[PDB]
């Protein structure tokens, strides 16, 4: 403290006295980050575990608003297999939520897999359903023998 | 005095967040000039309650007998079996008198039990020592002769003084007994003591309500500036908040030095009179009360001293 | 222990505490006369805590000159030291690196709230109460005048700017 | 600052001034203001009265049953006669017609000391 | 005593158009304090009397 006072006054020789230098502060060491419960849950069950679903040309739209929708533990346990994803990682997917979203259930080949996806032709891709070019979501195909 | 309050660099301007702090030195250092006025102000809040509440460097005690041949001075007096040392109308004074930012408030070098101890030698030496007490090393007058001094300056033959003695026993301690009556009724007449201390609280209060206040720009926290979006494009957004602070800094400093100046030429006219008419016989008019002056008794308060004139009318 | 705030509408920091206030199951945090936010509700299990945020100021160096003495005194302002990291627990605060002395002399360097600094002789710094000087007793007799037989003048001076 | 500092030199400087705590310490006696750059510096001499010594009084004197009063100064005592001083010094010296003026009654005031009171005329008239 | 003059907020900053009044909030409370000063001379100088 004999040299805190030296160096904030800018005088190599101090005068006698009652002086105030800097400030001190408390570092924290751990940042508490807490999420909400459960509470309202999106109808998730119905556009996934359901038991009959419509066709490729007779898709049906599903809006699904005002709950809390979880999108990670689909992707960290994973009894679902694939997902190539562009523009928006699955984390930040998590990340940025989006005043809405769509679920359309159909059912394609295994071919025409590859054929869903943003800039490309074909025969789900032409004649059935289309993704543009802007589309910020991506594919999630699995297996259900 | 009044209340001394002390911004800070650091916690004030910024919302702690590492990006403000590394900004402030792109103007150099504006807030050293506000460290150096800001204890240059606490300096004179500790020079002039040096002189004014102390006017002498001894103490000198009251005897615990008392006839005083029908006068009552133990009202204003301080009371030696309450354990805080305080007379009857400095009661009366203290209880009628009534942040996390950065904003504090410096307590001075002198608390509230000891300014009446003060007062207390100081009343002591109006009572024991008379006038000499200022005047160097005092001497033993008693009361009678104290008053034979002061009336002798306004030219009064004493054949009035000893004979209507008796008579003016009645009416000198029922004057402090009308204000004792008025100080617990009327709370108007504390005006001036409590008129420092709200302008104070205001000027606090108008330190308060500019962190929601936008200044121009998109919000008012430094978070979701530079967060939300780019810092290219949110160095214009930051460097006008804190120019947008500064500026309601720098008129906060230029009000604070005139609430100074107008408590460094108010202690000017207040150690004027304790150098006149409480010392000393003061022979002018309309200064120290409305009248022929005959004494002058202060008290103790937060924030300045409470005096009680005896005038002749 | 003092904090860092992560919610989803809320940021910054403080020490949270418990809090008796009466809340809403709709809001969120609630504010500050003082425009700081005091607290916050719960999502998960519906409860509000207070929020305080821990001790902070400036710090006081007491020291003399270069020539004299290198021995400092570290003062923290309005701040008790249990919960910071000769001990000796004021008013204005709690002040490490000094001792306290009972008797009552003469000093030079202020401190606040009614103590004060002094160097005196092995040689360290003490912090005590300031002083009000000697004491004398003046006796209260109808009969007795006190008059000087001799007096003793001198030269007082002062000094003001123009 | 220096309209106290002129309030010094038009009343410490330039006449006289009863009032005290202004010109220095108790009574002022004579001021020397001095030059220097960029202020003003004062000399003053004061009236510090050191060594005291206490002493016997009356407020008043019993003759004929007719009180007397005095106008300058207090009465002292040494415990033998009665004296009359100033405050500044102890100047003894005996009761007189010119020191006393004679008002009221001996009954009116209380702890009234008698005692006699020597005139001039008395001993001019036999001698 | 002097001569006592007035600053209000709308006139002195704005020409009388609409969008001159919607920035008057956005630097906020700033000419509320040039009220109760000047107004807080016009007692002192109610005091000077």
Same mark, same amino acid.
């Given at each position: 403290?004999?040299?805190?006072?030296?160096?904030?006054?800018?005088?190599?020789?101090?005068?006698?006295?009652?002086?105030?230098?800097?400030?001190?502060?408390?570092?924290?060491?751990?940042?508490?980050?807490?999420?909400?419960? /459960?509470?309202?849950?999106?109808?998730?069950?119905?556009?996934?575990?359901?038991?009959?679903?419509?066709?490729?040309?007779?898709?049906?739209?599903?809006?699904?608003?005002?709950?809390?929708?979880?999108?990670?533990?689909?992707?960290?346990?994973?009894?679902?297999?694939?997902?190539?994803?562009?523009?928006?990682?699955?984390?930040?997917?998590?990340?940025?939520?989006?005043?809405?979203?769509?679920?359309?259930?159909?059912?394609?080949?295994?071919?025409?897999?590859?054929?869903?996806?943003?800039?490309? $032709?074909?025969?789900?891709?032409?004649?059935?359903?289309?993704?543009?070019?802007?589309?910020?979501?991506?594919?999630?195909?699995?297996?259900?023998? | 005095?009044? $209340?001394?309050?002390?911004?800070?660099?650091?916690?004030?301007?910024?919302?702690?967040?590492?990006?403000?702090?590394?900004?402030?030195?792109?103007?150099?250092?504006?807030?050293?000039?506000?460290?150096?006025?800001?204890?240059?102000?606490?300096?004179?809040?500790?020079?002039?309650?040096?002189?004014?509440?102390?006017?002498?460097?001894?103490?000198?005690?009251?005897?615990? /007998?008392?006839?005083?041949?029908?006068?009552?001075?133990?009202?204003?007096?301080?009371?030696?079996?309450?354990?805080?040392?305080?007379?009857?109308?400095?009661?009366?004074?203290?209880?009628?008198?009534?942040?996390?930012?950065?904003?504090?408030?410096?307590?001075?070098?002198? $608390?509230?039990?000891?300014?009446?101890?003060?007062?207390?030698?100081?009343?002591?030496?109006?009572?024991?020592?008379?006038?000499?007490?200022?005047?160097?090393?005092?001497?033993?007058?008693?009361?009678?002769?104290?008053?034979?001094?002061?009336?002798?300056?306004?030219?009064?033959?004493?054949?009035?003084?000893?004979?209507?003695?008796?008579?003016?026993?009645?009416?000198?301690?029922?004057?402090?007994?009308?204000?004792?009556?008025?100080?617990?009724?009327?709370?108007?007449?504390?005006?001036?003591?409590?008129?420092?201390?709200?302008?104070?609280?205001?000027?606090?209060?108008?330190?308060?309500?500019?962190?929601?206040?936008?200044?121009?720009?998109?919000?008012?926290?430094?978070?979701?500036?530079?967060?939300?979006?780019?810092?290219?494009?949110?160095?214009?957004?930051?460097?006008?908040? /804190?120019?947008?602070?500064?500026?309601?800094?720098?008129?906060?400093?230029?009000?604070?030095?005139?609430?100074?100046?107008?408590?460094?030429?108010?202690?000017?006219?207040?150690?004027?009179?304790?150098?006149?008419?409480?010392?000393?016989?003061?022979?002018?008019?309309?200064?120290?009360?409305?009248?022929?002056?005959?004494?002058?008794?202060?008290?103790?308060?937060?924030?300045?001293?409470?005096?009680?004139?005896?005038?002749?009318? | 222990?003092?904090?860092?705030?992560?919610?989803?509408?809320?940021?910054?920091?403080?020490?949270?505490?418990?809090?008796?206030?009466?809340?809403?199951?709709?809001?969120?945090?609630?504010?500050?006369?003082?425009?700081?936010?005091?607290?916050?509700?719960?999502?998960?299990?519906?409860?509000?805590?207070?929020?305080?945020?821990?001790?902070?100021?400036?710090?006081?160096?007491?020291?003399?000159?270069?020539?004299?003495?290198?021995?400092?005194?570290?003062?923290?302002?309005?701040?008790?030291?249990?919960?910071?990291?000769?001990?000796?627990?004021?008013?204005?605060?709690?002040?490490?690196?000094?001792?306290?002395?009972?008797?009552?002399?003469?000093?030079?360097?202020?401190?606040?709230?009614?103590?004060?600094?002094?160097?005196?002789?092995?040689?360290?710094?003490?912090?005590?109460?300031?002083?009000?000087?000697?004491?004398?007793?003046?006796?209260?007799?109808?009969?007795?005048?006190?008059?000087?037989?001799?007096?003793?003048?001198?030269?007082?001076?002062?000094?003001?700017?123009? | 600052?220096?309209?106290?500092?002129?309030?010094?030199?038009?009343?410490?400087?330039?006449?006289?001034?009863?009032?005290?705590?202004?010109?220095?310490?108790?009574?002022?006696?004579?001021?020397?203001?001095?030059?220097?750059?960029?202020?003003?510096?004062?000399?003053?001499?004061?009236?510090?009265?050191?060594?005291?010594?206490?002493?016997?009084?009356?407020?008043?004197?019993?003759?004929?049953?007719?009180?007397?009063?005095?106008?300058?100064?207090?009465?002292?005592?040494?415990?033998?006669?009665?004296?009359?001083?100033?405050?500044?010094?102890?100047?003894?010296?005996?009761?007189?017609?010119?020191?006393?003026?004679?008002?009221?009654?001996?009954?009116?005031?209380?702890? /009234?000391?008698?005692?006699?009171?020597?005139?001039?005329?008395?001993?001019?008239?036999?001698?």
């Amino acid at each position: 403290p004999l040299s805190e006072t030296k160096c904030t006054l800018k005088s190599f020789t101090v005068e006698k006295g009652i002086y105030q230098t800097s400030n001190f502060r408390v570092q924290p060491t751990e940042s508490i980050v807490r999420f909400p419960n /459960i509470t309202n849950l999106c109808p998730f069950d119905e556009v996934f575990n359901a038991t009959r679903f419509a066709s490729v040309y007779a898709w049906n739209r599903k809006r699904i608003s005002n709950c809390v929708a979880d999108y990670s533990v689909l992707y960290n346990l994973a009894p679902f297999f694939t997902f190539k994803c562009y523009g928006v990682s699955p984390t930040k997917l998590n990340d940025l939520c989006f005043t809405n979203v769509y679920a359309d259930s159909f059912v394609i080949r295994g071919d025409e897999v590859r054929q869903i996806a943003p800039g490309q $032709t074909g025969n789900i891709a032409d004649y059935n359903y289309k993704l543009p070019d802007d589309f910020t979501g991506c594919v999630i195909a699995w297996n259900s023998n | 005095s009044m $209340t001394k309050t002390s911004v800070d660099c650091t916690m004030y301007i910024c919302g702690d967040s590492t990006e403000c702090s590394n900004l402030l030195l792109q103007y150099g250092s504006f807030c050293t000039q506000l460290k150096r006025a800001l204890t240059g102000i606490a300096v004179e809040q500790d020079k002039n309650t040096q002189e004014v509440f102390a006017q002498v460097k001894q103490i000198y005690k009251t005897p615990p /007998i008392k006839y005083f041949g029908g006068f009552n001075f133990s009202q204003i007096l301080p009371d030696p079996s309450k354990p805080s040392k305080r007379s009857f109308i400095e009661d009366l004074l203290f209880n009628k008198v009534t942040k996390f930012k950065g904003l504090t408030v410096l307590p001075p070098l002198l $608390t509230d039990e000891m300014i009446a101890q003060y007062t207390s030698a100081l009343l002591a030496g109006t009572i024991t020592s008379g006038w000499t007490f200022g005047a160097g090393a005092a001497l033993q007058i008693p009361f009678a002769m104290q008053m034979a001094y002061r009336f002798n300056g306004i030219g009064v033959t004493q054949n009035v003084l000893y004979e209507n003695q008796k008579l003016i026993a009645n009416q000198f301690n029922s004057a402090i007994g009308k204000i004792q009556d008025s100080l617990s009724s009327t709370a108007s007449a504390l005006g001036k003591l409590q008129d420092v201390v709200n302008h104070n609280a205001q000027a606090l209060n108008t330190l308060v309500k500019q962190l929601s206040s936008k200044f121009g720009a998109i919000s008012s926290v430094l978070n979701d500036i530079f967060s939300r979006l780019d810092p290219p494009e949110a160095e214009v957004q930051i460097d006008r908040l /804190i120019t947008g602070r500064l500026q309601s800094l720098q008129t906060y400093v230029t009000q604070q030095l005139i609430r100074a100046a107008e408590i460094r030429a108010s202690a000017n006219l207040a150690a004027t009179k304790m150098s006149e008419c409480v010392l000393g016989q003061s022979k002018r008019v309309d200064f120290c009360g409305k009248g022929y002056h005959l004494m002058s008794f202060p008290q103790s308060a937060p924030h300045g001293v409470v005096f009680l004139h005896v005038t002749y009318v | 222990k003092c904090v860092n705030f992560n919610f989803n509408g809320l940021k910054g920091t403080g020490v949270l505490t418990e809090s008796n206030k009466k809340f809403l199951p709709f809001q969120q945090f609630g504010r500050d006369i003082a425009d700081t936010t005091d607290a916050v509700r719960d999502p998960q299990t519906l409860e509000i805590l207070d929020i305080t945020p821990c001790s902070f100021g400036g710090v006081s160096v007491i020291t003399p000159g270069t020539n004299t003495s290198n021995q400092v005194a570290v003062l923290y302002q309005g701040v008790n030291c249990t919960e910071v990291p000769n001990v000796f627990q004021t008013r204005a605060g709690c002040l490490i690196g000094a001792e306290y002395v009972n008797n009552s002399y003469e000093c030079d360097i202020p401190i606040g709230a009614g103590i004060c600094a002094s160097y005196q002789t092995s040689q360290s710094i003490i912090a005590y109460t300031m002083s009000l000087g000697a004491e004398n007793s003046v006796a209260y007799s109808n009969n007795s005048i006190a008059i000087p037989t001799n007096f003793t003048i001198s030269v007082t001076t002062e000094i003001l700017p123009v | 600052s220096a309209n106290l500092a002129a309030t010094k030199m038009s009343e410490c400087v330039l006449g006289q001034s009863k009032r005290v705590d202004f010109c220095g310490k108790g009574y002022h006696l004579m001021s020397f203001p001095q030059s220097a750059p960029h202020g003003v510096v004062f000399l003053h001499v004061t009236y510090v009265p050191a060594q005291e010594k206490n002493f016997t009084t009356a407020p008043a004197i019993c003759h004929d049953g007719k009180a007397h009063f005095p106008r300058e100064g207090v009465f002292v005592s040494n415990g033998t006669h009665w004296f009359v001083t100033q405050r500044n010094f102890y100047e003894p010296q005996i009761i007189t017609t010119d020191n006393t003026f004679v008002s009221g009654n001996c009954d009116v005031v209380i702890g /009234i000391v008698n005692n006699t009171v020597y005139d001039p005329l008395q001993p001019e008239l036999d001698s």
